Amino acid sequence: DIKLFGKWSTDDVQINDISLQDYIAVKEKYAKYLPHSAGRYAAKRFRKAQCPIVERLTNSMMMHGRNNGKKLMTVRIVKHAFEIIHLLTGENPLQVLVNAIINSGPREDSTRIGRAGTVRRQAVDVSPLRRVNQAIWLLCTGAREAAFRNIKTIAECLADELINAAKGSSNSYAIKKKDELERVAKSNR
């Protein structure tokens, strides 16, 4: 058996949407012990859906300017973040991760169509891989905002967003930003 962090298992983790199912990783043969793998996943197109989505949450968390190469900093932020999820919920935190991802990526987006100087967006459809890509970005960004200038830890404030999105609650940052992009799109239609 291959436990993430030696203590979290994968066979419990259950994907709801078939839309996201082939574009969200670890269930069975993607199961790896650490997020850090360092493989060429952006060598050509549609290879970054085969990398483990904990490593996806890693690589989008080193993202800011002062943190911009420090991956072992980040897989430590991840490791302490799952164990705060488990102590607040008791669920396998990978399931909480996936239930926070699915509820986060929007499903219709606006797009500017027309000549320059004319702003008339039309709603289009959101790709499944982009809905993965949009959600992780919206998840990581909410960890920065409520934890840039206060006592709370980013290994902690990540776990407060990644729980509040698996509720689909209004308290999460990645939910309000889905409730805007997909609110604006249905006024563009």
Partner 1 sequence: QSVQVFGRKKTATAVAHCKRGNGLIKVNGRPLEMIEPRTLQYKLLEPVLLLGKERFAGVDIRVRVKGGGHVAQIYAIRQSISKALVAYYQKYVDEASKKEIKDILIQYDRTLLVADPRRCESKKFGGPGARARYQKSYR
Partner 2 sequence: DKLNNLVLFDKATYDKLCKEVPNYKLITPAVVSERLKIRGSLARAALQELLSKGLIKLVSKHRAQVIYTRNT
| Residue ranges binding partner 2 (CB under 8 A) | 76, 80, 83-84, 87-88, 151-153, 155-156
Distance CA 97, CA 5 (A): 15
Query: Is 72 a binder of partner 1 (CB under 8 A)?
Result: yes
Residue pointed to by tokens 């949009």: 134
Residue (2 or 88) nearer to partner 1, CB: 2
Residue (12 or 145) nearer to RNA, CB: 145
DSSP secondary structure string for all residues of 66-125: TTTT-HHHHHHHHHHHHHHHHHHH-S-HHHHHHHHHHTTS-SEEEEE-SSTT---EEEEE
Residues forming beta bridges with residue 122, ordered by sequence position: 111
Helix (H, G, I), strand (E, B) or coil at 14: coil
Query: Is 80 a binder of partner 1 (CB under 8 A)?
Result: no
Please, which of residues 142-161 interact with RNA by CB under 7 A?
143-144, 147-151, 153-155
Query: Is 73 a binder of RNA (CB under 7 A)?
Result: yes
Distance CA 113, CA 142 (A): 30
Least distance to partner 2 from the beta carbon of 84, Å?
A: 6
Binding site for RNA (CB under 7 A): 44, 61-64, 66-67, 70, 72-74, 76-77, 140, 143-144, 147-151, 153-155
Binding site for partner 1 (CB under 8 A): 2, 5-6, 29, 32-34, 36-40, 71-72, 75-76, 79
